[PDB]
Write a protein that binds this ligand. Sequence first.
Ligand SMILES: Cc1cc2nc3c(=O)[nH]c(=O)nc-3n(C[C@H](O)[C@H](O)[C@H](O)COP(=O)(O)OP(=O)(O)OC[C@H]3O[C@@H](n4cnc5c(N)ncnc54)[C@H](O)[C@@H]3O)c2cc1C
Ligand SMILES: CC(C)(O)Cc1ccc(-c2ccc(C(=O)N3CC[C@@H](N)C3)cc2-c2ccc(C#N)c(F)c2)c(F)c1
Lengths: 132, 662
Amino acid sequence: KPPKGMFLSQEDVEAVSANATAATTVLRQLDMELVSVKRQIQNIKQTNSALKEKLDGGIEPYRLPEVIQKCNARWTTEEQLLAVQAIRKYGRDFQAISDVIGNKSVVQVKNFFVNYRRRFNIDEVLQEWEAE
Amino acid sequence: SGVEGAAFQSRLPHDRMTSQEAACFPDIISGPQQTQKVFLFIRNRTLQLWLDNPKIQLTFEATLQQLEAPYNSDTVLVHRVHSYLERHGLINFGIYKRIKPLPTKKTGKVIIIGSGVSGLAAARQLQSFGMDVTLLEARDRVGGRVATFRKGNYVADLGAMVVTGLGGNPMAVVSKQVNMELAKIKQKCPLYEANGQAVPKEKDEMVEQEFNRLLEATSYLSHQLDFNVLNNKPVSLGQALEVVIQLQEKHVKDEQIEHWKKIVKTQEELKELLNKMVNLKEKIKELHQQYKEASEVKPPRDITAEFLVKSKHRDLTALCKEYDELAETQGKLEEKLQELEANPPSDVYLSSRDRQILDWHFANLEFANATPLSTLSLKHWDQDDDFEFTGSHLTVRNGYSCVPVALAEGLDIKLNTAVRQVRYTASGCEVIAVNTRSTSQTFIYKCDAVLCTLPLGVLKQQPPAVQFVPPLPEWKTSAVQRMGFGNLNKVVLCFDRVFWDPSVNLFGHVGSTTASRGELFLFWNLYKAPILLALVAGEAAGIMENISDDVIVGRCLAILKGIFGSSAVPQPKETVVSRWRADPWARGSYSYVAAGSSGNDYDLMAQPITPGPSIPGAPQPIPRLFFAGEHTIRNYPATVHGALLSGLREAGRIADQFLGAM
Ligand SMILES: Cc1cc2nc3c(=O)[nH]c(=O)nc-3n(C[C@H](O)[C@H](O)[C@H](O)COP(=O)(O)OP(=O)(O)OC[C@H]3O[C@@H](n4cnc5c(N)ncnc54)[C@H](O)[C@@H]3O)c2cc1C
Ligand SMILES: CC(C)(O)Cc1ccc(-c2ccc(C(=O)N3CC[C@@H](N)C3)cc2-c2ccc(C#N)c(F)c2)c(F)c1
């Protein structure tokens, strides 16, 4: 209804036109609520600027050089044993367990859980992972 | 249509009968539509004839000779039409050659107060109708607020210089009869701020758009949002502007508030993140040592400590996956803070260099309405806007006084005769005037009817310049309290040397305050000779009436020195100064629709007065006291045409009371 770029609700109107002053209240106080923010901005620009000083370093010094170990389904007593222990640190997480061992596919790791499950009391290997 | 163009030019609708032809053709309009469509032809034709040449009287014979049948046929109703039109001043008004000379069978005495256009129009009309008319004018000349200056080859209207279009303007006709040279006026208005250097396009254009945007805004504010009474007082136009503007100065702010409050939602998100990222870099520095430590334990090894290296190596590559996501997701957030911190909501509503130019756009408004916007009714100030003429606004190049004067030829005008008292009663009226030159010399005019063109200004005067006996009824007087009589004034600067730009008609000057927006806010050349007019409007013009002549021609020259340079602008060969509110035969410039008035007041102002009965128990008399001029005519106030129309009108009205039959 009002021409383009002109702003007027019986709300905004009735409020610049109660108390013979309450126009220069509303217009000349919002910019007080505006300055209060322009400072909160400043707080955080410093607060964050500080944390950005703590990250100069990156994590470049701490990156273990992750090599590809060409997968396998030869399930060594070596790897077999890591697996039980991994079950115990991890459970479910077929990925981590395979990430640990160095050759499965969550395929082959999902395969031990069940297949080798008979022989290594994996009941009591996951019953310790529900408690610690 | 062409015959319908005469209806338009006569301010009537070609396709329907008016509420007023109905008046006195209630037969035709009650009845069948064929008869109506014929009526209308005759009406419009008869007009077209008069118009197609208005410097000679159009008899009934002439109108019949020129109608082809089937309209030629109803010979009686063609008479009926020609007579309505003749009376009500739609034809055969202003200045003509009379084919039928004045019958000296004169019939009724009417005293008309004032030789203003309102007056002279009715006067000539009434005398055309056969009637003894005498005009009583306080001034030493005719025309009143049509006031033209002349010394040597210099000429300039000190009131009333525009023709607000010829499209349905009666003055169109008059200007044919008087052969007044009218000249158009060229759009271009260069504004010059307090310094003397022009405003540029860009800015100039910006503010007009804003001005206009701002007015429309008030109109919405009024008609739609209904902001028509802040605290049992009617609302000024000016008040609504102050409000509209203020809400534009709000918003502009809340715009900023919402933008910075959008930045913190960001900054504060990236903080909640920089924390996850610093604390990971902790879990990482550490976990890594542990994997250096357990990896140090060189092999062969038992499988619990092979598993220790194996497991810590996974867990460290987990966290570095994790922390790397967090620093994609970080520049994702320092991206958002370029976008926002880069282009912000707008700084301000209006520059103080702008709100200053905007003040000049308002001064222009205060000028044409001849009043402070403080005072204009919001609901009603523009009520005359549906009726504005077509055509370009023109200016009277040869001095507008030529018209009054023309009109006054052949009329009993008693000049310097200043009505002091108007008495009116059942049996007739007594008007008591005095001579202005000696106040003591007392005159008495007896008549059947008084027509009062006394200006609204004058009518308002307290204590009263003119006394009504008996007094005017509360309703009429109340109307006068209510309506607005406004004010403007003019400085007339006559030079030898055409120093402004010839191709430029008019150019503003921008005042430094709001309070001072009116002071010489505009300058106008329109005359063959080297004359510039300096116009004063608004709250200003009221005050500039006090400041001496030389002082005003001061600032006149000053702001011309600015706009043009001390080298270029002479002293002026001749000067003159409006000052209308002080002139006592005026008390101002023209009417306006004060807040709390409506257009209805203009109709109350026209309503004639009918006295009490002579001998109690007598029959209800006729009306004795009538009213014309620009304050009476709600569709055309504060104009020459409106005045002239009001006169045309009362004359018809008076005739119908005192000669009824044609
Ligand atoms: C500065 C100015 C500029 C204007 N510009 C324009 C314009 O550009 N275009 C436009 O269309 N209109 C304009 N007008 C309006 C127009 O001039 C008038 O509306 C018009 O002349 C009104 O005629 P009137 O007959 O109503 O009143 P007036 O013409 O004032 O005449 C009334 C007469 O009554 C006389 N009188 C007053 N008191 C007494 C008394 N006590 N006894 C006896 N006689 C008395 C006066 O002296 C005067 O002669 C302007 C007016 C002013 C002041
Ligand atoms: C607009 C600009 C450039 O400022 C010059 C200009 C042109 C026409 C008018 C005008 C428009 C409409 C009207 C006009 O018709 N109205 C509406 C009725 C009443 N409200 C005035 C009158 C003028 C005008 C009024 C006073 C003087 C004087 N002196 C003048 F020369 C012209 C105007 F006020 C100013």
